[PDB]
Nucleic acid binder design. Sequence first.
RNA 1: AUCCGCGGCCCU
RNA 2: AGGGCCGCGGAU
Length: 617
Amino acid sequence: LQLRPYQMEVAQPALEGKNIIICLPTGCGKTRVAVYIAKDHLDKKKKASEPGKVIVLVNKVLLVEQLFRKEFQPFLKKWYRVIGLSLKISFPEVVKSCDIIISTAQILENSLLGVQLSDFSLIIIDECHHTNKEAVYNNIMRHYLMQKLKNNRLKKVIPLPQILGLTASPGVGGATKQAKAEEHILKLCANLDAFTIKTVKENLDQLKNQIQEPCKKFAIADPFKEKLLEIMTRIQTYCQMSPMSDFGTQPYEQWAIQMEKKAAKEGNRKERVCAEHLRKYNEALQINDTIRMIDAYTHLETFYNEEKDKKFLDETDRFLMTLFFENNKMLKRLAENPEKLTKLRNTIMEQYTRTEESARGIIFTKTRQSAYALSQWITENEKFAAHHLIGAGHSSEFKPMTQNEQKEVISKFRTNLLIATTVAEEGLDIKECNIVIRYGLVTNEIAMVQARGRARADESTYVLVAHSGSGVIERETVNDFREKMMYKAIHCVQNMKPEEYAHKILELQMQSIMEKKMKTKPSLITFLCKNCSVLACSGEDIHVIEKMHHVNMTPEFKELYIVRGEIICKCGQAWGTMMVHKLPCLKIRNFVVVFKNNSTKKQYKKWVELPITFPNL
RNA sequence: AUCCGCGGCCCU
RNA sequence: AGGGCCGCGGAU
Ligand SMILES: Nc1ncnc2c1ncn2[C@@H]1O[C@H](COP(=O)(O)OP(=O)(O)NP(=O)(O)O)[C@@H](O)[C@H]1O
Ligand SMILES: [Zn+2]
């Protein structure tokens, strides 16, 4: 099944032709409306004796299972055949059978380079706002439009699907003006070839009483540090390095990176190694502002404890280790004794007293370490009388959670966990949510709306914990203004005259199509260790397996490293990782490449960037 | 146990 | 260009 009255008006144009976008406020239940267009569609095709299909593209693999089980499957189980997919089955073959297909976005893209658009009848799109020139989803929409222009020439026919997009909500990317904001929304319609945004107007009251917004709240605040800065300054005079920017902040952090890069090139030890150590100290200062002082210390302890094993000694590491390990006892002492220290502690407790048990809670924080550090802060410090969730991608030297392990935490939340701490935001379902605090996190107007929509119902409160300065609050205000600005922008395009709207939308389409004219895409090098200048591998000695893993099997290389699997230099600088098949792989980042033609040392972040091709194995 | 490639969003 | 964060795909 059944559609609520407000959801009927938004679905009416989609029901007959008229490819549209559907944007309804968060918590509206708008994935359900998509199911109704599908039923309407397929049933209509059987009567017309024409084929039926639906591709239902999504941004998350976890949404594939979630959408299937909750929305599309249970209603359509008897009538039509539904399949979710992200297990070693051929894609053109699933398309043969199975009236409805819920797939990860890229999975289709892969097969458009076989299966074509012409086969599919209707396309359903989760979070349309990702649609842009830059990314999935998608390039696929430009394939649809490119095919469409082909039809414009024929008239002067190949069948094209109906496109039903679903987003809350398009938003204005990075544009303060009211004029430019509209330009983004015309672009979003242009890429989706949708006729109108089709918001909810006639039934607006029905909704407002059904789904309520959280009241935005505000919390603000305004020894270890001076101890630590003292250490860094002495390290600075050791190398005769003057940054000119204050310690414990980003512009200074970026200067320390750039200094290490150039130091690898000139091959001067003490200049680079210190800078790497400085990056580590600076990290402690910047986290100490936003996180418990024990974590500031722990970040440095584990760093140094790992440096003893890597090493097992030159004058530099001795100056640094001796300097830290004498002060090690001191810092741990300062860490465990209680501005920044007290932050938000009251905030959750106020929510626990009001309602019987604060059954739901959600925190948002910038960094992965902060999620784990806060959770550990909340597990301790009972009586109250909490768990963390983080992403799957691999960077920063933290370990991603398993996708199933994430699925575990939400299912445990549906019950053992009262409060979760995440940077993931949109696309995962939580109900009965109230507090939803954002801790030091800015993001953009679209992430704000998705996150805000977490907590409903009822009486929900949306809180921002901020530093006095540099404030997040100034960036948050502008986000809100833009949230409000998108609505007026979504208004302009609906009441724009059809003759104008269609004429201009084409110029956005032909422009996006004409755009891609571009091209998509060996003994000349010698690799040196970056910490220390020693020949590691000449360029012949590297090999490639399956076009991906860059490996050195040359027995000479075996001599140069130690293990523990992780590969490390004589010096102790990490070199690579040991992958086992029945092959050692090395990260480019740990080496500095010397060009032969004239000696120039360039350093690379990843393998693809360097022009030379390597021999396959 | 990771690798590899691609892409978004932030901030300087 | 950096760092942080998020995600998809192809590997073993
Ligand atoms: N038309 C409907 N009639 C009855 N229940 C509905 C309807 N639509 C959604 N629901 C319920 O709402 C739940 C899912 O919708 P909801 O959690 O509010 O987010 P949603 O479908 O993701 N909307 P959105 O976040 O804006 O994409 C389901 O458990 C349904 O029980
Ligand atoms: Zn070395």
